[PDB]
């Protein structure tokens, strides 16, 4: 036995499918175009930001599969000064960390923010690279307010002020502050 309410449920399914497929299609179109447009803009900054942080060298971004803009990975190829040009997978731990920071700071040039909280992002840097990371923050603090949680002395030396957080009595954080500028 056939039922009208079932026939109507099937018609409604078919109708919803026609519209929802169009939504899904447009979402795929938005994601592919915005991914690629943004990738091009980030890439346009990456070599310069890398060189500012490393003090030289060069670096590149490359789509793993340029014809699959919905799923392609991004290859990062970088040459720290004094080293070979290599895939990021083969660089040292400190070089890898600083290259990731170079990508993040290139993203900030494409998608700026009024303030940026950096929570110990430079923990893994080689000590010799901290000063250029800290100088980068100072240079671009005119356009982005930087709030930097850090345990690297070179980063602190470029801050405008320091807030010190320490547990004088166990479990209870005390806060003191000093201006360097």
């Amino acid at each position: 036995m056939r039922y009208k309410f079932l026939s109507e449920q099937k018609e409604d399914l078919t109708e919803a499918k026609n519209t929802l497929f169009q939504v899904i299609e447009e979402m795929d179109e938005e994601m592919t175009k915005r991914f690629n447009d943004t990738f091009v803009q980030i890439r346009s900054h990456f070599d310069q930001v890398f060189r500012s942080l490393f003090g030289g060298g060069r670096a590149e971004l490359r789509l793993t599969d340029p014809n699959d803009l919905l799923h392609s990975g991004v290859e990062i190829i970088a040459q720290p000064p004094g080293k070979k040009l290599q895939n990021l997978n083969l660089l040292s731990g400190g070089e890898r960390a600083l290259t990731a920071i170079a990508l993040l700071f290139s993203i900030l040039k494409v998608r700026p923010v009024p303030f940026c909280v950096l929570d110990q992002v430079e923990a893994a840097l080689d000590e010799a690279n901290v000063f250029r990371f800290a100088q980068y923050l100072k240079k671009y603090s005119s356009d982005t307010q930087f709030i930097v949680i850090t345990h690297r002395k070179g980063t602190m030396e470029e801050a405008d002020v320091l807030y010190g957080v320490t547990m004088q009595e166990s479990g209870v954080s005390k806060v003191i502050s000093v201006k360097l500028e």
């Binding site: 002395k153 030396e157 003191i176």
Partner: protein, 67 residues
């Protein structure tokens, strides 16, 4: 390393008898020196060896030994 700095603050706390302004803990301090001193004081606070007083943010900081 801040333990070497921490040494000097404890020693300079015993030579003096009472309070010390943070800016006076060292006659003159370059920006690099100030940072390590600041970190030293925070560590001494954590080891319950120094008492700190500060009224507002960026006001003068007064240091006192604990004994």
């Amino acid at each position: 390393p801040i333990e070497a700095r921490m040494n000097e603050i404890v020693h300079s706390l015993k030579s003096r008898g009472t309070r010390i302004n943070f800016m006076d803990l060292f006659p003159y301090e370059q920006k690099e020196h100030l940072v390590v001193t600041f970190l030293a004081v925070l560590e001494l606070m954590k080891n319950q060896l120094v008492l700190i007083e500060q009224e507002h943010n960026f006001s003068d900081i007064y240091i006192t030994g604990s004994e």
